[PDB]
Structures are given as C-alpha cells and as structure tokens.
Amino acid sequence: KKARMTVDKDYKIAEIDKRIYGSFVEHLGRAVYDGLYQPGNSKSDEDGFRKDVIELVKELNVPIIAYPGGNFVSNYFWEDGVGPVEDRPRRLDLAWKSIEPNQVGINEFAKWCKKVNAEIMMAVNLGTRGISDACNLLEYCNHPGGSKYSDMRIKHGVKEPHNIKVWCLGNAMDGPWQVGHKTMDEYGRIAEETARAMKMIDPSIELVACGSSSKDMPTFPQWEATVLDYAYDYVDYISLHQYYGNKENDTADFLAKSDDLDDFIRSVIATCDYIKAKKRSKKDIYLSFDEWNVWYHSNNEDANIMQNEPWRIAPPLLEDIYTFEDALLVGLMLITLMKHADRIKIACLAQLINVIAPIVTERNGGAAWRQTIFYPFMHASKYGRGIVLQPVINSPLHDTSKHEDVTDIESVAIYNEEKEEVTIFAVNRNIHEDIVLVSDVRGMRLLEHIVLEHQDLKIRNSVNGEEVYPKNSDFDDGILTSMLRRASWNVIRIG
Amino acid sequence: KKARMTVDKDYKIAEIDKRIYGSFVEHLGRAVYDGLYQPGNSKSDEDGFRKDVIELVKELNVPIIAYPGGNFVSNYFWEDGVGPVEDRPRRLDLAWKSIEPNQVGINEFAKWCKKVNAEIMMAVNLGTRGISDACNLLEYCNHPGGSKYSDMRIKHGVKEPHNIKVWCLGNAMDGPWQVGHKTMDEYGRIAEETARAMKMIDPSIELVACGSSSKDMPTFPQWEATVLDYAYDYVDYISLHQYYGNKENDTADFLAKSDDLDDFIRSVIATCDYIKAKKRSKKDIYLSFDEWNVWYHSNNEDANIMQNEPWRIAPPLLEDIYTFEDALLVGLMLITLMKHADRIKIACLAQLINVIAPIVTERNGGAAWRQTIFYPFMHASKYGRGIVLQPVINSPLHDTSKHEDVTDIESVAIYNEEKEEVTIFAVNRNIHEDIVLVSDVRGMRLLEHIVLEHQDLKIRNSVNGEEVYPKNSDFDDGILTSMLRRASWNVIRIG
Amino acid sequence: KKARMTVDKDYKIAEIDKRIYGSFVEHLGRAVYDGLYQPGNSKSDEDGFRKDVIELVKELNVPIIAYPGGNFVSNYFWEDGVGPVEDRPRRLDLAWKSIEPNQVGINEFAKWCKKVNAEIMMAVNLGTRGISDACNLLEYCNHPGGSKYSDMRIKHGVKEPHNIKVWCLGNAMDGPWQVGHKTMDEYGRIAEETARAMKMIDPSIELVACGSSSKDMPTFPQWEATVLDYAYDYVDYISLHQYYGNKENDTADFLAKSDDLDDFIRSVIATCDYIKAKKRSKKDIYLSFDEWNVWYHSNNEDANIMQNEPWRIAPPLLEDIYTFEDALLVGLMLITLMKHADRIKIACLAQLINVIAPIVTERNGGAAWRQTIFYPFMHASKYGRGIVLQPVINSPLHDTSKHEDVTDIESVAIYNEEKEEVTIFAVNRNIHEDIVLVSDVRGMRLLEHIVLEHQDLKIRNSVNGEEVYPKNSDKFDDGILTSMLRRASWNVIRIG
Ligand SMILES: OC[C@@H]1O[C@@H](O)[C@H](O)[C@H]1O
Ligand SMILES: OC[C@@H]1O[C@@H](O)[C@H](O)[C@H]1O
C-alpha cells in the first residue's frame, strides 16, 4: 500500500529527444482515404485535408511521422504518387489486398505534415526495388534543383526540397507474409549498399536499419546483429516493433507486459553494443521504435475483409476500438520508452489516423473523435520534454498468471529545466489495490495532478462521447505524497 | 512367347489428370512464325492462324499448352508482345540466335489456345527479370480491371481476364548455355519470393517450380531439393525434363529407355517426399513433366544454323523427322507417365508445332502433316482418360547393350467407368519376337485392337504420305488373349 | 659506375601488344568538360572538340581508350547520354560529387576516338545495373540493325555499329567508397552471367573481369581468384590498378616502386595460373593494366572540393602537376609493363586529359600543354613496338629507406623487324651517380640516344613552357654499344 520513490536532479538518465513522440501513417485502411484525406468534405480544407483531424494531431504534439509504410512500402513505386493526379495509376496493394489510387503521394503528404507541425520520416522500397530507386527518391526530395529528379519535383509544383532528415531502409522483411521477404544476409547487404549511396547524395540525413518484425521471430536478435555488422558505419538507428493484446482477457497480466517491453529494449541495446565492440567503433547506434501500440481488437474483421471483399479502396482495416485498460498499457509503454531515452531517440505510435489509432473518423465522412489511448500519449508528449531522471524505486510486487514480481507502481520523472517544472508519470497497475506513492524530491510548487481513471476497465470511447478523459483532479516539505488509485494513470507536476 | 497380366479395378493407381496430355509451344524456329501463325496463307483464318494446323491440334485433345518457353522465356520481355503490333519491337533472342519479331504475343497466343480448345500454362522470366515483372504479367492476365496492368489489357483489346491457372516460375536455369543461369540457392530464393507475391495477387493460381534441366546435370537432384526447401509452401509442382535419342543406332537399347524414365520419375518423387518430411507439410508436391519427347535427329543442322546463319526470323531449328521406332518409344513414355499418374498431374509433349513436334508444316507455307509420334500421343490422349489400374504383370525379359532385365511387354490399363470401357496400352519392345499377352480381367466384350506396326523400324511419315498410322488390325471368356506383334504399339479396348 | 647488358634478338619474351600503350578517359573533373570537349572555343572543331588536344593525343599514338570509368560507370545510365541532346537529363555523379550534364555520351566519345585514331574499351555499369542493361548497350553498339537497340543507334544518327572490341565488366567494386560495392562472390556471379549473355549477342568481343582496387586491399588476391573461378570460361582478361606517390618526399625510394609493380604483376599471374590449373583449362587469362599512373599531388585540394563545393559541372579534380622525378617513375613503370608483355596485353595510363594526365588544358578555355609524364609515354609508344627481348643485365644495386637490392639501371630492348630498329629504353634511378651501360648487341649502327634529364627533380612543366622535354644524347662500334646514362635519367637509345 506504500511505495517510495526518490527523485534527484543530479541523477539523470538522458535528455528526451522529442522524436520519441512521433507516429506513423501507412497507406492502409482508412488512414488516408476517408481518413486524413477527404476531398469534398465540409470539414476539409481546399486541398482535401480534414481540418478537425489536423487539430487533433496537433494536440498530440507529434514532431515526426513515419511514412508510407509499413508492409505497404515494400511493393510501392513512389513515382506512382507524384505528378499530375490524372496520370497516376491505380495499383494493387499486395500487403493489404486493396486498390491504391495514389491520390496522396509524397508531395500531398508533405503538405499535410506542414499543417500538423510534423516532419516526415520516409521509408524506401527495398522489397521489390533497391539502390537506384532509393537514390532517385532522395534526390527528388532533398536535392535543391538542377538534376533530373530535383527538377522533376520542381516541375511537380514544389520548388523547395522537402529536406527529409531521417530515412528508413525498407520495412521489416523477415516475415513470410511480406512482399520481398529477405534473409538477414540479403537484407544486410542491400541496406548497407543503399545506405552507402544515399549518404553520398545527402550526407546530412540519418538512416534507420530495420530490425526484426517482432521479438518473437526466431531470427531475432541475430537479424539485428547481422544488419548492423554489414551496415554499421552508414546507419544511425536500428528499428524495433512491438504490439500487445489482451485476447486472454487477463487485465492483470496485460498490464505486466510493459516488463517484456523493457526486456526487449535492453536486448536490442546489448546487440548494438556487441556489434559496437566488434567494429571497435566509437559511434553508438540508437533505437528507432517506429512501430508500437496495443493491437488485437479488430483481428477477425480484418481477416474477413481479406479475402472476402478484396481490392477495395480504403476498406476499414485494423479499426481497433480501445478500452480504458488499453490506455493503461499505452501509458505503461510510454513510461518504458521514457526510461530508455538514453538510447531510444525515435518512436512512432502505430498508427495515427483510424488504423489502430488514437484518432478516429467515422466512416463515409463522419466526425472525428479521440480514443482512450489518445490521452496518455497527449500527456507524455506535452509534459515529457526535458531530462529523464533515474527512477530509484521500491514498490510492492505482485505475480500474474504469466509474469512474476511485476512492479505494482511503474513510474518515471522528467525535469524540465527551462520551465522549473518536474513531471512525474506513474501508473498503478495493481488492478485491485489502491496505493500511495511517497516521492522524496531531493532537488529542488505542486502544480496539479491530472488522472486517467475509470470504474470500468473495458469501457470504450466513441463518436458519441468520451468516457475516458483527463480528470484534472486530486506535497509540502520536500516529500510529495499523492495517491495512485487502482488501475490509474497519473501526471503529477511540481513547480 | 507368353506373358501374363492381371487387370482388376480394385488395384487402382490414380485418376488421370487430363493435363498430362498437354504440350508446349516455344518462340523457337518455325513453331509460331511459318508454323501455327502464317498471315498471308490461303489455309489461314482471319487472325493469321493456319486452320489445318488448328484441326490437327484438336485431334490430339491437348488441354493445356506451355508458353512461351523454354530457354526463350529467360530473356523475354512480355510487354514487347502486347499492344499495337506497329509499336512492338524486334528483339534479339539470345537462346536461339534469332530475331523475335513479337507479332505473336500473349493475347494472340491466348486466342489461338481458345481455337484449339486448350489453355495456357504461362512461364515468367526469372532469368533477366524478377518479382515485380511476374506480378505485372499476372495482374495483366488475371486481374479483372480497375488497376494499371489489368486496364492495360482491356485497352489492348481483351476485355475479360485470361485467368491463367498454372504459372511456371521461370525455366530451367542450371545450364551454362542459358542466359540468366542461377545457382540452386539463387533460383530457390527468387522462386520463393516470386511465388509468395504472385499468390497475393491471385491465390487461385497454381505454381510450378523448375527442376534441373535434365537428370544428367551434376546438380540434379539437389537442385530440386533446394528449390522445394525454399519455396515449398507456395508452389504446387516441380518440373522434370527428359529427352531420349537413338544416335547409337540400337533399337533394342533405345526402347529400353523408358526404364530410366521410370527411375527418373521415382528419384524426383523421393526428393519431393524428403522435403515434405523436412517441412512437416501435409501437402504433396505433384510433378509437372513439361518437357518430354524423342529428340536427336536434327542435332547437327541446328549447330550449323545457330553458329553461322544467326539472327534470322524463323530459322528451321529442331526439325526432327521421326521414325517408326521413335513412335514406339514415345508410346513407352506415355505408358510410364500413366503408371505415375498419382504424382504426375501435368505433362507436356515438347513441342507441338514443327519444333520436335508431332505436327509439321512444310516450310514457306506448305501443307501440314502428321509425324509418326503423332499417333501414340493421339491414342493415349483419346482413350487414356479414367483410372490407372495397377499393372500386375509377368513378362519375358531381355538384355540390351546397356540395359539388363528389360521387360518385353510394357503395359497399363485405364478404366473409364463413365463409358464402361477398359483400354489396355501395350508395347512389345522385343523387336525380334512376337509375344502373346494373356490378360486376366477380373470383371467387369472386346470392341477393337488398334496397332501401330511396320516392318521398317526407320520409316518416316512425310507431306507425301503417312507410312505409320493406326491400323484396325486384330477374348471371349473373362481372359483377354491378345497377340502383340514384335516392335508394335497396341491399344486394346474392352467394354 | 658500369652496368652491362646483353641484347640478343633470339632470346625473346613476347611480341608487344600495342594496347599496352592505351589510356583512359573518365567523366571526371575536367577530362571531358573544360577538357577534350569545349563547344564555344576558338580551338574547337565542328563537334566541340579541342583541336589542339586532339593533336596532342595523336602524338602519344594511343590505340585504345577506356571509357566512361572508373568509379563513374558504377552508377551511370548509358541511355542518358544518347539521343537528342536537348532531352538528355542532368544526373548526380555520386562518385565525384559533380553534376554530369551528359552532353558527351557514347556517340560523341566514339566520334572523338575516331579523330585521335583510338578505339573504345567500354565499361558497363555493374554497380546499380546488370545483365540486361549490359546486353542493351552491347546491342546498341555492335549489332548492325534490325533490332530494338541497334535501330535506336541508327535513329540517333550512327548508321554503322561502333563494333567495340573490348568490354570491361563493371569497375573494381571492392572498396567501401564505391557505389554498388560488391563482395567477391557477388561480383564473381554478376560478371559471370553478364559475360555469358554478352557473348551470346556478339561472340567476337573480348571481356575484362575486374580485379581488386589495389594490391593493398585485404581481399587481394582472393578477389581475383574468386572472380576468375566463376567467370573463367567467359572472360579474357583480369584487370590491375596501381598508383604511386611521393608524399614522403624520398626520391630514391620513390623510384624503387617499379619493383613493387613487378611483384604485383607476378602475383596476379600466379593467381591466373592457379585458377587455370583448377579449371584444367588450355586458355591463359591475360592481364589488362587499365589504371596506372603517379597520383598524389592533388589529394588535399580534391578533399576540399567535396564537400564545400559539391555538385558542380566540371570541378577541377585530380589535377596533379607532375615533376621530373614523377616522369622517371612513369618511365620505370612502362619498362616494367614492357618486360611483362607476354601476359599484359592491355594497359591504360590513367588518365589522358587534365585528370592525372600527360595533357592539360588550363581551365575556362585554353591553352593546352604537356606534363613531364607526357614524354616517356610518347617515347615508349612510338619506339616500343616489336618484340620484347629478354633483359640480361648486370646492374649495380643500392638500398633505399624501404627497399633493398634495387637495380641502378632498368632497361629493356624492343626489336622491330619491319624497321631493323632496336630500341633500348633505360632508366638510371641512382639519383647520385652517372653510370655507363655496356650493351652487347649479339646481333647485328647507332641511330640516336634520346634523353630526359634535369637538375631539379622537382621541376614541373606548365602552360608557360616545358622545362622537361627530350634532348640528345651522350652517346656503338663493334657489336658493343656503350652509353653513359646520367644521374636520374630516362634514356631511349636506338640502333639501325
Ligand atoms: O502497423 C501496421 C502493420 O503492422 C506490421 O505488420 C507492418 O509493419 C505494418 O504494415
Ligand atoms: O525444347 C526446346 C528446349 O529444350 C530445352 O533445351 C529448353 O528448355 C527448351 O527451350
């Protein structure tokens, strides 16, 4: 019932890179068509972008958006999505068994990222294409002018280069369900050679090597080791993907899965440092966690849609509707991301609009709304800039059906120096027993105490109203005392 | 003089897949140009197809035709053969040192297949092209509309999709004489990935993985093992190729060669089942015998042509003129195919027109006529539909120069119970002795004994007449007693 | 003081293939643009070709020129350089951080080679491209007509096929500074299948497989053995690359480096013979030394030009200005090449115009002069055609900072039978002592003794004048030719 945590400014983990509050838009389902892009809608601007969605994205303070995939990119031909729209083909999207009409391509999606105050992180097709097509796309986007592909961008109506900073070398290609599956050795080579050439066009870019499609793949983490062995000198990040689900309907074990996330991350870091010692390099590889979220609700509808009604434009795929308990895990996942901010410098919640997303528009042009997971992310991105202090914590333990010694209270604190504030994120993942956390600030004024709680752990949000929303609700010597209700998300700020 | 055999509808082998009576047209020599396609000719229809050639193919009841190669496909660019004929290029055909004019492409050959009531088995180029080109060709042929390459087919004048059922992942590429020669691991990888992508576009197709170019390559049968190991989950067949020759002028040892055919088939079946165990699959790989024939007569003239008269259109290559003994061995090969109809589901006489073919057009628009090998195939395709019955047979044996204990009488019975007939196929390949076949027919009337025989084992057919052709030449109890002339082919039907 | 040589016309090494006097033009720096190709210029002809440069090349009697690279070729798309010039794109040259405007492509460069009496040895892109693109280029260039790419050539205004004889399968691709870098097994496989398919289009061409970037690469010589293992039956040559520098500023050691060249050539020959025994083949692979020169003066200015000033048309890259001691090592390398004429059949001075070149044009459109290295190459190419006789030399030796037992004199005799000339090429690389060379022409009138010498080993040529240029002599009565060879000199002594 008690839990003691001592924060101290002097005990840093690292500065937060803001790109860990990024997200991800794939040409999948209604992410784009009847998603952020709805040409005649009364709620859209003259370019067809839903303005209410733009506003909801800006509320999440997303600085970087992965695009356009995802499994989609591994058979995408980028030239299909630029130039006059009347001349753009329709294409089969093999990954998601849909027709892609290519109304949104590089230039429309870059315009959209301007409107939501975000940058693109661009993925290139290394499934069915290779080096020279990555070079062309990079020249098109980043070279000012005076060459075949920069002048082509100019002739398409974009005089200034997009100057995309981070590029991703394909998508995860270790699974037998993706077009252009590669062995680790094949992918290591194409990534090394694509990376080599791209850095010769634009040496200021950063590059992401793709890790395994999940930690459960038998080739994890040898895949990461092999790719980094080949490409180390030319890439800056390795990517990780992780999704969690609660089909077993075990909310106690569900919220313990953040422990598996912590272990996955350290595994990837050890793998990077193993290859570091092997190359005798002084460079550190950072982590790009460019696919993470809860994902399990829509699994069976998606299987129906493929292949019952295949080859639709914008079929409603991956439309997970999230519960309060899902928001609790998304919050736990964010706490775990923060705790490893010394190595994780990029992360993308997957995905942003409609597809397993914090932001939903109702089908056929309907209204936009916030899912339960919208709010833990909004809080983390708003108050979680600054310096991650080392959580030194003793907290009660519990076991679940499949995890052991699960921390009762997961927590981290982030000192914003320019603002003299200190924000403490804490989840009580004791489903039953309320707990108090006593926090010895030895720093270094109790601003507020925002909470995400609800009676019903399976409650949902909808276009008819949010049942889950930040209750701006609930310190005086040096020790801060606030109470963590069972199954709750807590944002405690100090000034 | 005496050989005995028990026929019994309870010792089934398998139901015959009629696709074992298939054939093969490659863009080679006079197969197409000055072959089935002759636009000026008086005997040609509105599309330029020779109508007498069309009639002869239908007499063979060929249900499936492989196209368009062959070594030719390994450097073929299928876009060169579709669209307005005025804009189609002339290409160098490296395999056969010829100019391909591309007057006949997929759409013309598909129309021709309709007129001979056959359908296409399409090979894709995995020599100099790869995944995305195979996907484009499949989309073009099988996707109905609303996408780049399907709409391209429609605009080219073919509104409905061809819906090609069986595709071949390349041609054999183990030979140093083939453009795009692959190692077995290289071919396995590209076959695996091409098949994976193709089945995402059209999951109803079947795919054929290529075997060794012959049983005599050092990489047979490890090539088959390796390809199947990579691609097992996505393919349905493995291909086999076999040609026999009588360059040594030894008819006895020549006719013994279907024994090595049987052994060859067993070797490939064992290879498939070894991999099935390795995979723990419940699927059996079936065999596609998409190249088999006698071929040796024209070998020296083809050296002359490729080496000194290169880059012609329609050079007269591979124009074997077949003898009566060649027809006997073709019959022995058809019997062996029938004996393995449990695993062999597709087979292709290589080839259908002019090129090592049962059908010949003279040259420079001359008349069409039937080679000796035409009639064993016509008999087998006409009456060999139904259930292959296990041959329990005790026959005299003989030695030849290079074969030991060769059975004198080779035989199988097919039981068509929807017509209530039992057709016995038998060859006496003892050339020096006549032999009586006592056939115990555990019942279940004789309707005819049909023969191909001749005194002159080297006699040929020609445009001036057929010397080898079906003769109606000649059981009461339940015991079928049939006299099998030395070096003869026999089709004895009971009902 | 005394070195003795025995020249017998019956002790032969081999007939000299004149393609050992080849050179090389890459789309690099000012080789093409502001070099051989200058449209506006008063010195330029109807095609835009500097006529003064054309005549300078013709004096070197260069029979074959490799083109278009070099690193450049490894990401070159040849179609960008043919067809109407108004429709040719500008492209990023990742190798040299330049813009390639493609005003000179294969058909302009083929015309230029006609004007200097040379042929192209063409390199195909095996970096980012492969089999089918090499087939297309070979058909465009060598197939008469009646097919897609041969007719395309005709449509572009070249009715006759170029009929290019020697093709180079990519460029060396073992280095991490190269677009499309390959492991030895990757390159082995791609070279094998490119070669196989190309020889089906035109069986009369000859093919060069690429060796390592230099002997110093860790994968040398295993790269050469693997590529030859794969492609042996389909290729005719293996390539070698060698450059030398004098950044340590040690003239004696510098001039000893032809000894390393000799060791390098033998190592590659052994490698060929190893694979030959492995293949039980009756065919020897021949050597193509298609990059060799002195190269070091311009390294630092080159590093500055990328970055700081990247993506220019025609940046002034690799503009080494050669000293007299550089010309001596160039002469020593040509002597070494001559001594291995039985296996080296193609060699390429890298490069011909402005880019580490014997011929310079001064930048922004004039005026064109000859570097110090121009002249040993001119002598070797003009008088070094015939039979390499076997060098029997008793030369005094000397040690240097990093080399031992270095001959003071390097010499080789080339017997021309259609002229009754013998030519003795000799270098005295003892920087300190004149040496008399006694040649016993067990033969068989002294025709001349040409000399390249100077008091300043660091003196350079320039547009303002040649400081280094040929002179006579100093200076044969029985069957005994005696000739004093100066301190640090290049010597061409001719008999008739
Ligand atoms: O997040 C959506 C999909 O999940 C993963 O399988 C893919 O990378 C991505 O396309
Ligand atoms: O039947 C002709 C040729 O036989 C084999 O050589 C090839 O696969 C095929 O093109």
Ligand SMILES: OC[C@@H]1O[C@@H](O)[C@H](O)[C@H]1O
């Ligand atoms: O000679 C110029 C360069 O030297 C080597 O680096 C390359 O092969 C070539 O491009």
